[PDB]
């Protein structure tokens, strides 16, 4: 193998890392193999893949299981104080499986978010374009784009012998000059692996947020009219009819800005002229002359909020220190003091990103009430 000279041979080598990080990788392994296996069992065997989102959710759990296969290799790697005994081939596969799982999982969530926008907002116009053949071709492209993105993890990842400490590690060697490694390999994980897909995921669920709000606020405007019409019928003085007719005019204009609504608002304005002059009987008749169980979930906005923030806060620690790794590689910063805090937090950020990512096929599954039903029958 190659012999290299580490600039900061003590960066990241901490005893609390050699104990806590391998233990965390074991927790991610047990929880990941447990959760993602049940998602495959419920979807592929109890549901037979009948929707587009089921194809994405199945491959989202399959790609996570492939990452967890190499996770014990990194657990004992960190346990032996960053010593790689599995040879050069097994690291080109293990380092690629980490990079392949990042792009694949984030691409699948992007298309799953786009599918949720089309299904909720345009159910009739996007039904014929969202088929099973499109869902499978989308996944094989996601595999290729992820493999094309994890290609440098197979070409340049090598086993290097460190002359400073006689320790055999596997790594990217950020050579000072004449390095065959691309300069901004960490920038690709920033924009293609986080920035661009998150902006598509955030946009998709923001459009769903606005669409459901327009529908829910419209239903609230009709409920305000009918409830106030019942208040007018049970009113006894001019104040009760004036307060209810004022709420109806305001609700009618709210419902209009969502087209004979001006005809209704004009008649409410006529009923207001009667209630203001002390005519209580004449105002009740006007509202009586002019004028059912839709499904609704007022907690869907909390779910949309949780989906977006769970993707952001799980990857934003890993992507920031990945971007900090690019600055050290480009020469913007060469201090070994900041290389230590970057090399220590990087296993921490991996424990946060890939533990939340291996719970995504399970969390997205529990959103489907049919999936939640088969899941609890397996545990019962």
């Amino acid at each position: 193998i190659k012999r290299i000279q580490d600039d900061c041979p003590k960066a990241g080598r901490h005893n609390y890392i050699f104990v806590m990080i391998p233990t965390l990788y074991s927790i991610i392994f047990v929880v990941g193999i447990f959760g993602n296996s049940l998602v495959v069992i419920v979807i592929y065997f109890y549901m037979k893949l009948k929707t587009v989102a089921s194809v994405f959710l199945l491959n989202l759990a399959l790609a996570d299981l492939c990452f967890l296969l190499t996770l014990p290799l990194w657990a004992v790697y960190t346990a032996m104080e960053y010593r790689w005994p599995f040879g050069n081939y097994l690291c080109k596969i293990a380092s690629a499986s980490v990079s392949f799982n990042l792009y694949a999982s984030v691409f699948l969530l992007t298309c799953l978010s786009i599918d949720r926008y089309l299904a909720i907002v345009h159910p009739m116009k996007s039904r014929l374009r969202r088929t099973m053949l499109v869902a499978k071709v989308t996944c094989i492209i996601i595999w290729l784009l992820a493999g094309l993105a994890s290609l440098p993890a197979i070409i340049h990842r090598n086993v290097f012998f460190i002359e400073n400490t006689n320790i055999t590690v596997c790594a990217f060697h950020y050579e000072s000059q004449n390095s065959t490694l691309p300069i901004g390999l960490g920038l690709t994980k920033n924009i293609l692996g986080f920035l661009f897909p998150f902006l598509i995921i955030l946009t998709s669920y923001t459009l769903i947020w606005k669409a459901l709000k327009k529908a829910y606020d419209l239903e609230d405007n009709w409920e305000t009219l009918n409830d106030n019409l019942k208040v007018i019928e049970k009113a006894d003085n001019a104040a009760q009819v004036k307060d209810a007719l004022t709420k109806m005019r305001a609700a009618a204009l709210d419902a209009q800005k969502a087209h004979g609504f001006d005809i209704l608002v004009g008649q409410i304005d006529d009923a207001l002229k009667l209630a203001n002059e002390g005519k209580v009987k004449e105002a009740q008749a006007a509202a009586e002359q002019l004028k059912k169980n839709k499904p609704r979930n007022d907690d869907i906005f909390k779910i949309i909020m949780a989906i977006v923030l769970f993707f952001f806060f799980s990857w934003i620690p890993h992507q920031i220190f990945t971007f900090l790794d690019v600055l050290i590689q480009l020469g913007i910063i060469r201090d070994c003091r900041i290389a230590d805090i970057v090399d220590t937090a990087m296993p921490i950020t991996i424990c946060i990103a890939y533990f939340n990512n291996c719970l995504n096929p399970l969390f997205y599954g529990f959103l489907g009430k049919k999936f939640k039903r088969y899941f609890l029958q397996l545990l019962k």
Partner: nanobody, 126 residues
Framework: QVQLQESGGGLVAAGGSLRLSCAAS????????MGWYRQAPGKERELVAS???????NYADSVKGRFTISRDNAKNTVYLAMASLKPEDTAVYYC????????????????????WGQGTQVTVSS
């Protein structure tokens, strides 16, 4: 399940009229959006018309001005009043409907909250 029964198909001469019906049965709650699809022989399926619970309709360019889709939210039935039928309209017309469960999460890995019908044949001869 949300079943869809369609009726009204038949062989009519060119330029005639027809009225397709499709009532939704087996739904505890109201259907959200319903519409009609047709599949010509040898050609892919297309969306003819759709109408929401509010009354907004979206017609295809090949049937705009001729077909008039309507519905009755009380009975959860959609009506496709076809007029000036052309031999190009000879296809199997399918009924579609979107129905969400109680407290909907808008995630369905079983049917995508989308339900179809059996299909009624509509033939227009010269």
């Amino acid at each position: 399940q949300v079943q869809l029964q369609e009726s009204g198909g038949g062989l009519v001469a060119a330029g005639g009229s027809l009225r397709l019906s499709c009532a939704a049965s087996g739904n505890i709650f109201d259907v959200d959006i319903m519409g009609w699809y047709r599949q010509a022989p040898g050609k892919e399926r297309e969306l003819v018309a759709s109408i929401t619970d509010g009354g907004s309709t979206n017609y295809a360019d090949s049937v705009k001005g001729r077909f008039t889709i309507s519905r009755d939210n009380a009975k959860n039935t959609v009506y496709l009043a076809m007029a000036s039928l052309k031999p190009e309209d000879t296809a199997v017309y399918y009924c579609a409907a979107v129905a969400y469960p109680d407290i909907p999460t808008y995630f369905d890995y079983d049917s995508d909250n989308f339900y179809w019908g059996q299909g009624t044949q509509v033939t227009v001869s010269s």
